[PDB]
Description:
part of a larger assembly, 3 chains, B: about 80 residues, mainly beta, three-stranded antiparallel β-sheet, 1 helix, about 15% strand, C: about 350 residues, alpha/beta, 11 helices, about 10% strand, 26S proteasome non-ATPase regulatory subunit 14 (chain A)
Amino acid sequence: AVDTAEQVYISSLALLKMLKHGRAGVPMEVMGLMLGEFVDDYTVRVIDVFAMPQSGTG
Amino acid sequence: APPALWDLAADKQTLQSEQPLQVARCTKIINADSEDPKYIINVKQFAKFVVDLSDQVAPTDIEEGMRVGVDRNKYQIHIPLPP
Amino acid sequence: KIMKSEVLRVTHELQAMKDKIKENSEKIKVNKTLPYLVSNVIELLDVDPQRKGKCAVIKTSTRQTYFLPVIGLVDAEKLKPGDLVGVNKDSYLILETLPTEYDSRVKAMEVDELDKQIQELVEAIVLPMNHKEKFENLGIQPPKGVLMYGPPGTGKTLLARACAAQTKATFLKLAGPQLVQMFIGDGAKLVRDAFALAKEKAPSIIFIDELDAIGTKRFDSEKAGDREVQRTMLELLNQLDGFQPNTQVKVIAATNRVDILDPALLRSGRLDRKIEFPMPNEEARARIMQIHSRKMNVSPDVNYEELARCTDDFNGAQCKAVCVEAGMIALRRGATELTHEDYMEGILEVQ
């Protein structure tokens, strides 16, 4: 039962990829994934970000 | 307030019972069936919708021009109703 | 065969294609499975100046007009101003077009699952479903429109309805006043829709009655209520003339009175067969009555003379009504088997 202060690190990579995902942000429901490495508990870093093919199920 | 007391005390599990049954498409009524997988349904807003029958409702329990409860999300029919 | 050794690589590329189309052919099923609503499609030809101009006009059930070209897979019966088309979210594209007709109601009219003349009639209705394979060598073109008429009291309606059971196909029922309504311009829509159902469905049987009353050209110049079925018939003949699809399922017409006749009804696609009824005989009616009553239990002694003689200017439905009436009092007579005198008793009863 322990909780610390976490802060999400965002680079230009994931940002621009989410901008392209913004162009992909058509009303059709879309999927995406984020990758990175955890050095410790209270910090989180994301680096590799890509998109996913659309589907009719959503 | 006293009759609503025990009910207010019984309103605790309603939060955990809120997840199902909550979906309402406002009971759109059907018309006819050309084929079994796909049915044509006409809402009271005069907008025709099409959705496949779920596994929770038997195709033999479907009557022509019958009002049944229908999901507004999955668009399928979870449960029918007598009236 | 050294030059033909390069074919193997080609076949490998082809089977590789067949292997790599699995996924893109797989996504079709999950994507196109559930169209969320139904929209009206109207075809409009545009011009781009390949870069060929293509477009369409859409009408949503929510009354919101959008823009979109003509797309989707290979189309055949499509491009027509129909309804019930597949559509995805925000895409407003066209995937599966199925025609259920317009204002369905007219279409669900009904669901149905004298020897020398009835022989010719039976042969006439049987031959288009039979001799088509022999029509190539013989070059015999089957008649389409068939005019069945005669003096009142014949009972030709239930006779043709009885022949419809012999055709084994689906039978429909359309009357004269059914073509007359309060609205206007119903003729074209009715004809086009009926021909649409005739195009989509199996070679069923279509029979219309009372074409004489609705086909009256009213020599008297003062007034009358219905001019509509006149031009409806004219348009019907037009589509039965200038159209190649007319080789499809036939439409049978019948007139009660010969007072009104259109000289333009003569054609292969139009009315061809003309048979006048010269006071139909008795024994034949007794025969068909025997065929109808063979199912019921009756004492097998009948002179047939009395029942043949007592029938004058009576329909077939009236003869069946005589049989039914004979079955009515046979229940309260206490007898479990129908007798001979019950027939004539019924005749003198209802008539």
